[PDB]
């Protein structure tokens, strides 16, 4: 029965119990249920008034932590004689939560999530001699999945007639704005046992509803005579969180952002054949008090 | 009292005499889609006794070096009976499932089965960074075999797979397990040919062992869809 | 002792489970030691291309 739990449950005193027909310590794991044996029923207890609050294991508090989701250093200079794969004072980022593994393993403790994303953008700069650090203006334009992303720093997609841009400087506090719950479903699919399209050559595991969009970030300034290395870090805090159907935590190291492929480490712990590091025997106690 | 059980759906019925208490997944029972959660505006077909009935898959042989078996739903039923015809002629489906898994042996056999229904079991491949293709996921009626069941073939852990709706078939205790699954999706209805929502996994945590005569022990899966709706009528693909 | 007959398997198995009770509590949230990385994951550069 659903009830409101604010502190952990108390303990009642118990006495000697020697009754036939009543075996509270015997259970049936085959039913799929967890044991209902109380501490009052297994050993003889005292009355303990338990005042330990349970508010830090709330799913809101467990998940509303600002975690790093993106990180790009890109050279800020004159790019008239650079390569075809370089970031010419701008970058695009297909928004995911699967690149950095602390937030990934935490979100993948659930099958479905419904949350508002609070995005914090932290820009830092280094001189690529030393003459000082410029207070550069950056534009982070939110391009949805379906629109056109810019191909230049000075392209005309950056005018943002309808795309939401934020204009922020390096000397400012970090730029912060809230992205809503933007899924076409009622919850995001953290795991998607399916294929994204109607033909059989689609991508497995990537629900297109889960992807927020693109995050195109440029430097609005024109180039100086010297070059700079501008590092942009994006931090996401989930909020107003509903979570469904919790999952086993991932034990093996992640291989890719696109799938749940697994290799494991070479030896235990977190290996393919041994998740827990080994001991000598089942009757060997590793940290034994001498 | 919780060991005998008769599950009557449609023109089908299953009696079992060594059962456990059956499992309702997340405390939920299957229902039809209500009007305040409906999306598709056309009138759905509800072929009640024609589709809400047990369908029995092919039995798998339960051996010494078995790793485990998995069937993805509704992919294991998309070609069987009037459920499969309603799947192929419609765009949308919505149903719960009543999974009954059968496995019996003598009182001299030992072994334990983790019979677990996994929501949205996105699989992973081993020792590569290429995603699993279409033929590695959509095995159909026959289902698949676990490659590394200790990690549930997705880097997770078999040890923590009891967070999912599950039962056990311990041959000392019972010979059947029953899980009642509701609709489990972020969507009200879904395209059944490109998305699987429940994976029934059946895993040898304690292997089969005896010292009496070696008969074949099979494991049989009977799956009943429950509360099937279908929208988007067209031709069959 | 474990006493079995001649047609039963002479080696039997236990499975150990553990849960927490409802007087259980946790606080002071920290990062988990159970996952880490020293490089980028595969195709994480493709998110910028």
């Amino acid at each position: 029965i659903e009830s409101i739990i604010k502190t952990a449950t108390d303990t009642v005193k118990s006495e000697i119990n020697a009754e036939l027909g009543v075996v509270p310590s015997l259970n049936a794991v085959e039913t799929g249920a967890t044991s209902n044996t109380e501490p009052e029923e297994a050993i003889q207890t005292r009355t303990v008034i338990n005042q330990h609050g349970v508010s830090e294991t709330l799913v809101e508090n467990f998940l509303s932590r600002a975690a790093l989701v993106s990180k790009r250093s890109f050279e800020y200079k004159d790019h008239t004689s650079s390569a075809a794969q370089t970031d010419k004072n701008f970058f695009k980022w297909t928004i995911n939560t699967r690149s950095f593994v602390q937030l990934r393993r935490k979100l993948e403790l659930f099958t479905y999530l419904r949350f508002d994303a609070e995005i914090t953008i932290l820009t830092t700069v280094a001189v690529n001699t030393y003459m000082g650090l410029p207070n550069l203006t950056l534009q982070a334009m939110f391009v949805p999945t379906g629109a056109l992303t810019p191909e230049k720093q000075d392209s005309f997609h950056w005018q943002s007639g309808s795309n939401a841009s934020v204009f922020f400087k390096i000397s400012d506090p970090p730029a912060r704005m809230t992205i809503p719950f933007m899924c076409i479903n009622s919850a995001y699919s953290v795991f998607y046992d399916g294929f994204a399209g109607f033909e059989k050559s689609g991508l497995y595991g990537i629900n297109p509803a889960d992807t927020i969009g693109n995050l195109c970030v440029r430097i609005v300034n024109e180039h100086q005579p010297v070059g700079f290395t501008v590092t942009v870090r994006v931090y996401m805090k989930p909020k107003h969180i509903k979570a469904w159907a919790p999952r086993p935590p991932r034990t093996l190291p992640y291989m890719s952002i696109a799938n749940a492929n697994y290799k494991g480490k070479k030896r235990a712990p977190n290996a393919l054949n041994a998740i827990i590091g080994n001991r000598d025997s089942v009757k060997t106690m590793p940290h034994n008090i001498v | 009292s919780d060991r005998v059980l008769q599950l009557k759906l449609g023109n089908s019925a299953i009696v079992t005499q060594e059962a456990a208490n059956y499992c309702c997944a997340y405390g939920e029972w299957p229902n039809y889609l209500p009007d305040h959660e409906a999306v598709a505006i056309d009138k759905p077909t509800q072929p009640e006794t024609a589709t809400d009935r047990f369908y029995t898959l092919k039995s798998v042989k339960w051996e010494a070096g078995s790793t485990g078996w998995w069937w993805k739903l509704p992919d294991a039923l998309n070609n069987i009976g009037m459920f499969g015809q309603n799947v192929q002629h419609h765009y949308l489906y919505r149903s719960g499932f009543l999974i009954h898994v059968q496995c019996n042996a003598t009182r001299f056999h030992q072994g334990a089965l983790l019979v677990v229904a996994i929501p949205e079991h996105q699989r992973g491949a081993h020792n590569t960074n290429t995603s699993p293709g279409f033929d590695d996921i959509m095995k159909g009626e026959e289902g698949g075999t676990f490659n590394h069941p200790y990690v549930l073939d997705d880097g997770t852990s078999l040890a923590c797979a009891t967070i999912f709706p599950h039962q056990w078939i311990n041959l000392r205790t019972n010979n059947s397990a029953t899980i009642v699954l509701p609709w489990m999706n972020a969507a009200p209805m879904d395209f059944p040919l490109r998305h699987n929502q429940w994976t029934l996994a059946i895993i040898p945590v304690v292997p089969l062992g005896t010292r009496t005569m070696s008969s074949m022990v099979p494991i049989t899966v009977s799956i009943a869809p429950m509360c099937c709706e279908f929208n988007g009528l067209r031709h069959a693909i | 002792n474990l006493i079995v007959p001649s047609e039963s398997s002479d080696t039997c198995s236990l499975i150990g489970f553990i849960a927490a009770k409802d007087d259980f509590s946790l606080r002071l949230m920290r990062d988990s030691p159970d996952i880490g990385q020293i490089d980028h994951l595969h195709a994480a550069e493709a998110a910028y291309q």
Binding site: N61, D116 | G27, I163 | -
Partner: peptide, 29 residues
Amino acid sequence: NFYKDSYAASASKQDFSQDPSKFTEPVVE
């Protein structure tokens, strides 16, 4: 919250309803 959108608000950390029996006692009896 001086913003006009309700998702702009701060984190809602006051949801103390539990139901462990949908995971610990999912049996019908």
